[PDB]
Design a protein around this ligand. Structure first.
Ligand SMILES: *C[C@@]1(O)CC[C@@H](OC(=O)/C=C/C=C/C=C/C=C/C(=O)O)[C@@H](OC)[C@@H]1[C@@]1(C)O[C@@H]1CC=C(C)C
Ligand SMILES: [Co+2]
Ligand SMILES: [Co+2]
Length: 354
């Protein structure tokens, strides 16, 4: 019908003819046959993007200090499952809800028992994904409550918009990175009496996206010096930028919560019973999409952590631990998914919020 208060109507019931809203369409830096031939694919990305837009609006209305990180992720994911109309691997969540705090830039979500509470001075990166038929939206924004971080957030938002504007068919990936760094490094911020020039986090990257494949193998650098590989017609990219007051480099840190089957590993016969059962659970529920330990718990799984280690040591699954700059530093992120269509560039996850 029309969407409800706390949103509860699936996006497919809001648009009954199966035609979903376009995102921001941009001339490259006009009605092809080739573009129209892939219309069912662009449409699937747009259904996933509208879910993402409606979920994040809802999240911005209630996220507050005092909530636990588990409470925040569970409330967000509940809404996302409802609006995407979760249906096995045909529609659902593409990857776990990131809510990385402070010096941590990516790949933290709480595991069971985590008592972390969101604080007034925290800078929290909300990064979550939706998909229809494997067509994935990766889009992320930063949440703050103290106005002291406003210029750091504006620097990163401007750098992400700069990378989105530079992107195009036949554009060299190294040129997008050099562009993003020049804008991000034009910002200086002052936080609690200390001044900083904002630094891109040089070992974090954007990435191409493939069907059921969050990282399809091409990386989008956010500093100069990368590869001159060109972007191609038909590719889809997550253009993401990260900025920091610290060293501008991340390392692995904290407990791991995010995992994903290696895309190129084939069928592996396993006899160990608990390891075989967990691999079957992952193949049925996630396939090649990323998952977290809270999502195994929700399925009624327990006593799985050694079976999960076994699958990692066999190379069937890869762990993706949180990625953090040095203690005391502040990091921020903004990201959109773009489609490199034959007739135009589409920023499919653009909203009136960012
Ligand atoms: C999750 C994510 O999208 C985050 C941003 C991208 O990550 C990276 O660029 C990874 C760099 C890691 C560097 C580690 C250095 C360690 C040094 C040390 O410990 O000494 C992005 O990848 C381009 C990444 C992702 C897409 O690849 C992940 C798959 C997605 C999941 C798990 C949700
Ligand atoms: Co992301
Ligand atoms: Co991403």
């Amino acid at each position: 019908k029309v969407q409800t208060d706390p949103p509860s109507v699936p996006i497919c019931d809001l648009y009954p003819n199966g035609v979903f809203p376009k995102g921001q369409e941009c001339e490259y830096p006009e009605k092809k046959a080739l573009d129209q031939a892939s219309e069912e694919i662009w449409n699937d990305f747009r259904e996933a993007a509208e879910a993402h837009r409606q979920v994040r609006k809802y999240v911005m209305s209630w996220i507050k200090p005092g909530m636990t990180m588990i409470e925040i992720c569970e409330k967000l994911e509940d809404c996302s499952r409802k609006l995407i109309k979760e249906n096995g691997l045909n529609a659902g969540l593409a990857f776990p809800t990131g809510c990385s705090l402070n010096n941590c830039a990516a790949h933290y979500t709480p595991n069971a028992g985590d008592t972390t509470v969101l604080q007034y001075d925290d800078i929290c990166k909300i990064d979550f994904g939706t998909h229809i038929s494997g067509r994935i939206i990766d889009c992320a924004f930063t949440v703050t409550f103290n106005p002291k971080y406003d210029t750091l957030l504006k620097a990163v938002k401007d750098a992400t918009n700069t990378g989105i504007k530079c992107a195009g068919i036949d554009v060299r990936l190294c040129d997008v990175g050099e562009a993003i760094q020049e804008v991000m490094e034009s910002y200086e911020v002052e936080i609690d009496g200390k001044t900083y020039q904002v630094k891109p986090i040089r070992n974090l990257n954007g990435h191409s996206i493939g069907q059921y494949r969050i990282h399809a193998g091409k990386t989008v650098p956010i500093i100069k010096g990368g590869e001159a590989t060109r972007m191609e017609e038909g590719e889809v990219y997550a253009i993401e930028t990260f900025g920091s007051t610290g060293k501008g480099v991340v390392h692995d840190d904290m407990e791991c919560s995010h995992y994903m089957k290696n895309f190129d590993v084939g069928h592996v016969p396993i006899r160990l019973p608990r390891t075989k059962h967990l691999l079957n659970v992952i193949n049925e529920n996630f396939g090649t999409l990323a998952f977290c330990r809270r999502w195994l718990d929700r399925l009624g799984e327990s006593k799985y952590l050694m079976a999960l280690k076994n699958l990692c040591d066999l190379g069937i699954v890869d762990p993706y631990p949180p990625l953090c700059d040095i203690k005391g530093s502040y990091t921020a992120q903004f990201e959109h998914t773009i489609l490199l269509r034959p007739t135009c560039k589409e920023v499919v996850s653009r909203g009136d919020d960012y």
